[PDB]
Amino acid sequence: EKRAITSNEQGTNNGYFYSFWTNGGGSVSYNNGAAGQYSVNWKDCGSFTSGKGWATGSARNINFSGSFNPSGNAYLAVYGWTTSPLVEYYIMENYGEYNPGSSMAHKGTVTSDGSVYDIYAHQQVNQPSIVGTATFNQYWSIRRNKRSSGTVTTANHFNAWSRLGMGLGSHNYQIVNTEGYQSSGSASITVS
Amino acid sequence: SQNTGDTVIIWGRNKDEGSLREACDAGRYTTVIISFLSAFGYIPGTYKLDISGHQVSAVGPDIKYCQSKGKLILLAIGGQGGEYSLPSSQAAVDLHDHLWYSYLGGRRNGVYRPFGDANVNGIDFFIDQGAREHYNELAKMLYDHNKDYRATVGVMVTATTRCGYPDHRLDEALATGLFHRIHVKMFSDGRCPAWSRRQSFEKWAKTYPQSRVLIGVVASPDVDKDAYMPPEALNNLLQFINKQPNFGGVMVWDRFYDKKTGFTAHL
């Protein structure tokens, strides 16, 4: 149980695509498990993203379940990237002690998979991303009640975004992302 | 099947292997390693691509097509022969700027990019011959671009090694700790004997716990007779070596014989 991943890696594990990225700050340990399960443990992290999913996103339904115990700022969300337009999208089902909604442009309200999400958009200018330093938008769907298991009909959220001028491009990857930022905690998620 | 990781196929060693779009539609691979980039360094001037004669004009649009299907494309440098090395620390810099602006995410105004606007996802250090010449400085120089990248491995640095540990010609760059993946060849000069394959792979795995270590196998006995393992035998060996925590999958040489034998299909 001492063996773990602590540097950036990307690939497939037990049929599922997986990605772990960190800026190096603090101590973050990631571990792939059976099927589509992963776990992560971090302490005074800088910034990291982690999770299993699909190497090519789509309007698929996403099943997730597990435990998510942060001590600070952390996210649990369906997460992915699209190119042309460059988009980084979140479908947040759970988070720690910080909600980025109050610092983003509230743009609408969608209801899907048992709750109502608040939709936000935000522009990143010359910020790092999956194709280098670039300018892109962040699409957000933030659940009002925080669950640790369920299904995500990504077609619903992708429809309201396109309905509100937030169009996606060619999907890049799509995962259930446990993301931390200047915090500590632990998470164990199964993706299906 | 006992392969819990990636399936990497090596491309560009026989003209009749088909296209690059062909491999990404076979539904059997997760990563393609373009091969090779024969000569560099010895001659400070021209950098020699060698893919045995493939219609180089379509590799670019093919590189972009696979990434749309979740595939990852790697550029392999070196090989067996072709007069490659990095004589001076200056040759690594020129090789770096060649990779960054011609293949990778960098852009100049007067450089030619054989692969168009498509970007190769990383460089594979297929350093079979040569010496210990300045690949560690090239590794650090390529890895540095990852600071512009978020939530991904922007520029992946992998290596293809001898079977016996340590590889005298790659142990320098491997010590950096910057290599994401290591492919352990079972099938070229420095063959492992069958009675020491598992022990040699486990030594490589335990030495680099922060690198995903993959096993390199041939797809047909025509490539290496004393190193070939039928799919059933390879699955038995995987049942032991996949218990390593950093086991990364299998790398198959090559696309040509994987077409003829259907090796990865029976695996």
Author numbering:
A (entry chain C): 6 to 197
B (entry chain B): 6 to 272
Sentences from the paper on this structure:
Plants have evolved xylanase inhibitor proteins as part of their defense mechanisms against phytopathogens. The rice xylanase inhibitor protein (OsXIP) is structurally similar to GH18 chitinase and homologous to wheat XIP-type inhibitor (XIP-I), which inhibits both GH10 and GH11 xylanases. Various inhibition and interaction analyses showed that OsXIP competitively inhibits the hydrolytic activity of GH11 xylanase RXyn2, but not the activity of GH10 xylanase RXyn1 from Rhizopus oryzae. Although XIP-type inhibitors share significant sequence similarity with GH18 chitinases and adopt a (β/α)8-barrel fold, they are thought to be devoid of chitinase activity because of lack of the catalytic DxDxE motif, which is completely conserved in the catalytic domains of GH18 chitinases.
Crystal structure of OsXIP in complex with RXyn2 was solved at 2.2 Å. The crystal structure of the OsXIP/RXyn2 complex showed that OsXIP, which has a (β/α)8-barrel fold, extrudes the loop between α4 and β5 (Lα4β5OsXIP) and inserts the loop into the xylotriose binding site (−3 to −1 subsite) formed by the inner β-sheet (palm) of RXyn2 jelly roll. In the OsXIP/RXyn2 complex, the cylindrical cavity formed by the palm of RXyn2 was upright and stacked on the loops at the N terminal ends of the β-strands of OsXIP. The primary contact region included the interface between Lα4β5OsXIP extruded from the (β/α)8-barrel of OsXIP and the presumed glycon binding site (subsites −3, −2, and −1) of RXyn2 formed by the palm. Residues 154 to 158 in Lα4β5OsXIP intruded into the cleft from the edge and reached to the catalytic center of RXyn2. They formed salt bridges and hydrogen bonds with several amino acid residues in the cleft. The Nη2 of Arg155OsXIP made salt bridges with Glu93RXyn2 Oε2 and Glu184RXyn2 Oε2 and hydrogen bonded to the phenolic oxygen of Tyr95RXyn2, which are highly conserved among GH11 enzymes, respectively. Of note, the electron density of a part of Lα4β5OsXIP (Arg155-Val158) was not observed in the free OsXIP structure but were clearly observed in the complex structure. The guanidyl group of Arg155 in Lα4β5OsXIP was shown to be critical for the inhibitory activity by mutational analysis. In an I-formation, the barrel axis of OsXIP and the central axis of the cylindrical cavity of RXyn2 lie on the same line within the OsXIP/RXyn2 complex.
